């Protein structure tokens, strides 16, 4: 099945289907705890702890209930609750939070917000990229209340440039083009792409993707789309055939 309770209970195992582990850094801030629950199991995570994605299904969004807490003088205080989403590929994975409740400035109040957490995996080294050819990636774009978006992305490894498109999100303004952008090395010389998104040729935000896998099998990242109701965040993950 979805292996949600397995993920909350079992040690990492490299013989499980990759990606087998994701380090929770953005997803759990220092001074805070993240409690995930699903299928009758629960686990509490701190900053830097591993999430066992090896037990989860590939190419799908896995969903947990979450509580964000802080420990104050021996007592656990709930700051936020909602759904924690995990999208798993073979060399990459990402997390996201759909907030449903926050503290009532000792009570909770309803509040909805969607953000991307961690994007990680087996980063492709910029210095070990294919020297040429053109790779096509297909996968998913997901945002608040919508995991049905389709991402297409193409990389030209000679030009070291990529571009793509998001389609089929229920909110039409989110189905943006991912404009041509250069592959660059980041601080650790990981291969990364950052560029603008476009809607009807108009600039409408940005996107960034990492390249993952020894043979650049995968891309994963996120986009920010500017709207009159705020920035909307979209998780991005795609893979070659």
């Amino acid at each position, epitope marked *: 099945g979805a292996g949600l309770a397995d993920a909350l*209970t*079992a*040690p*990492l*195992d*490299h*013989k499980d289907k990759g990606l*087998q*582990s994701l380090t929770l850094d953005q997803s759990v801030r220092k001074n805070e705890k993240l409690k995930l629950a699903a299928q009758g199991a629960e686990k509490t995570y701190g900053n830097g*702890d*591993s999430l*066992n994605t090896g037990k989860l299904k590939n190419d799908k969004v896995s969903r947990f209930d979450f509580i964000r807490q802080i420990e104050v003088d021996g007592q656990l205080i709930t700051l936020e609750s909602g759904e924690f989403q995990v999208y798993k590929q073979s060399h990459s994975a990402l997390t996201a939070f759909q907030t449903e409740q926050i503290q009532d400035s000792g009570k909770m109040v309803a509040k909805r917000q969607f953000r991307i957490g961690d994007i990680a995996g*087996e980063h492709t080294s910029f210095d070990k990229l294919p020297e040429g050819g053109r790779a096509t990636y297909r996968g998913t774009a997901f945002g608040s209340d919508d995991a049905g978006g389709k991402l297409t992305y193409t990389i030209d490894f000679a030009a070291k440039q990529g571009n793509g498109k998001i389609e089929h999100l229920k909110s039409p303004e989110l189905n943006v083009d991912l404009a041509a952008a250069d592959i660059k090395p980041d601080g650790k010389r990981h291969a990364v792409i950052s560029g603008s998104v476009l809607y009807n040729q108009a600039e409408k935000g940005s996107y960034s993707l990492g390249i993952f896998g020894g043979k650049a099998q995968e891309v994963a990242g996120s986009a920010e789309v500017k709207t009159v109701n705020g920035i909307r965040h979209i998780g991005l993950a795609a893979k070659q055939l």
Partner: antibody
Framework: EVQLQQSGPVLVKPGASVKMSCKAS????????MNWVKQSHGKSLEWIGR????????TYNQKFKGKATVTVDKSLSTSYMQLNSLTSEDSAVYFC???????????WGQGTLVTVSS | DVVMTQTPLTLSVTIGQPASISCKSS???????????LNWLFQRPGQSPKRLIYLVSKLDSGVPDRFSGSGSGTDFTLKISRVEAEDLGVYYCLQSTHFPYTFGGGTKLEIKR
């Protein structure tokens, strides 16, 4: 910083038993398998067994069946290995080592030197 | 059990020269596509082993790039492009595809000077 801190050297008598410990710090103990390994003086390494710290399930090298028992105490983030019916062939250094199959760092304890003598 | 036949037993090498160690298994260490569990370890006298290479060819953090691993199936090789003085010690291969896990007998690298 991760450490695997093993218990100190010990002398034990032939025919008796010995129990040694590996205390893990700096990571969630239940997230990784733990291995135990034997090294007789001047010899190669020998794998004894592996434990799942989250539930205590174990796998053993059949050469150590009835000799070695591996356990854990989650609340103390510690693994233990007990050797029974000791002989001079059990005199060796024993190591605990975290899961070494994957990209996650393969930590080793500092070893415990066991001497079997009367 | 899977027998790991590691050769040479001793390698005597001058600083700056290359070095190669071979490990042959009695049955293939292929686990599944892209996963072959062959590690190379290194141990200084009186100290604990450390891992240098995992999954045949992946270098651990904190290991110089002079070290490389290759091979497939039953035949694996650790290479040191140019030996430095601190490379002396004992190197072991280790398979984790099959239980029981098993180790080569070790290669002791000694420095000629």
């Amino acid at each position: 910083e991760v450490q695997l801190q093993q218990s100190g050297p010990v002398l034990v008598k032939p025919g008796a038993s010995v129990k040694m410990s590996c205390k893990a710090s700096g990571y969630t103990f239940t997230d990784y398998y733990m291995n135990w390994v034997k090294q007789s003086h001047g010899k190669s390494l020998e794998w004894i067994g592996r434990v799942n710290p989250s539930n205590g399930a174990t796998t053993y090298n059949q050469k150590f069946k009835g000799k070695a028992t591996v356990t854990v105490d989650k609340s103390l983030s510690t693994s233990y290995m007990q050797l029974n019916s000791l002989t001079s062939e059990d005199s060796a250094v024993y190591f605990c080592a975290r899961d070494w199959e994957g990209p996650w760092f393969a930590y080793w304890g500092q070893g415990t030197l066991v001497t079997v003598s009367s | 059990d899977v027998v790991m036949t590691q050769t040479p037993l001793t390698l005597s090498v001058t600083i700056g020269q290359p070095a190669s160690i071979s490990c042959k298994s009695s049955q293939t260490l292929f686990y599944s596509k892209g996963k072959t569990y062959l590690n190379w370890l290194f141990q200084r006298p009186g100290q604990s082993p450390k891992r240098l290479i995992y999954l045949v060819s992946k270098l651990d953090s904190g290991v110089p790039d002079r070290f490389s691993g290759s091979g497939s199936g039953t035949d694996f090789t650790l290479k040191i492009s140019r030996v430095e003085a601190e490379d002396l010690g004992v190197y072991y291969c280790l398979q984790s595809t099959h239980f029981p896990y098993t180790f080569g007998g070790g290669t002791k690298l000694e420095i000629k000077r």
